[PDB]
Nucleic acid binder design. Sequence first.
DNA 1: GGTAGACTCGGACGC
DNA 2: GCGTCCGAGCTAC
Length: 253
Amino acid sequence: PELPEVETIRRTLLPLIVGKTIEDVRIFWPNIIRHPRDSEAFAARMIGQTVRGLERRGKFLKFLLDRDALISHLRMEGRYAVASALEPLEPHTHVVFCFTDGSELRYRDVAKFGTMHVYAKEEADRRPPLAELGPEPLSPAFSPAVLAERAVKTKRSVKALLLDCTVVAGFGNIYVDESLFRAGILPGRPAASLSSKEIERLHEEMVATIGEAVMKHLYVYGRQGNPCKRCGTPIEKTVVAGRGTHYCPRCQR
DNA sequence: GGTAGACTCGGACGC
DNA sequence: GCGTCCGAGCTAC
Ligand SMILES: [Zn+2]
């Protein structure tokens, strides 16, 4: 999922688990557990803790417990559901947190690409995978000034810049392509080549792109060969920053 | 230490 | 039977 869908998972999952106490943690694919590296230590430390909250940083979910935080990344196929311990698990269920009320938080992931890290809450933000993560795109911490500073200092492409998770949290191939289209900026443009006006432009469209999706329709992503929705020019697809990049050669400069 | 590119997690899938 | 592919987020010069 992208940032907006992760926010939806966060918002909807929370009431379904808040105040529940973990009685057991069952792990069927230990490779998903990245910290502690020993999945048995992972399971043992969580037993007895109560879920107190659920936050999101970038595309990471942060489950807040009594002492620990559980940092979870769904990657492509990761999904959480809450269900009764009396019912058969669904396929590709790799981790299950059993609560004292007979309900379970189940983690499914056909790809097995998702990750889980557990640390004392006060440490989570300075350890992998959260350490270094850039500001939230919808927060005042992410500002034109911040973007300009990273842009001027680098030599790489504007697309590469926006894909950098230290620059801003949760911008993937898709939202980068769309934001650049709406700001009228070619993705292969050197970040340093952008004018102040262009920076403000890009920042404003990045926020609008993420923001509209979080609250509530693509221009370029995947649409190569189709007419641009603003000028009718065929959308193109190339490689920029070792990525498949979608753009309109007329709207974007 | 900036940064391009490799790397990684499985397993699907088409030759 | 082996390369090619998903793509978000360690390593060499
Ligand atoms: Zn156009």
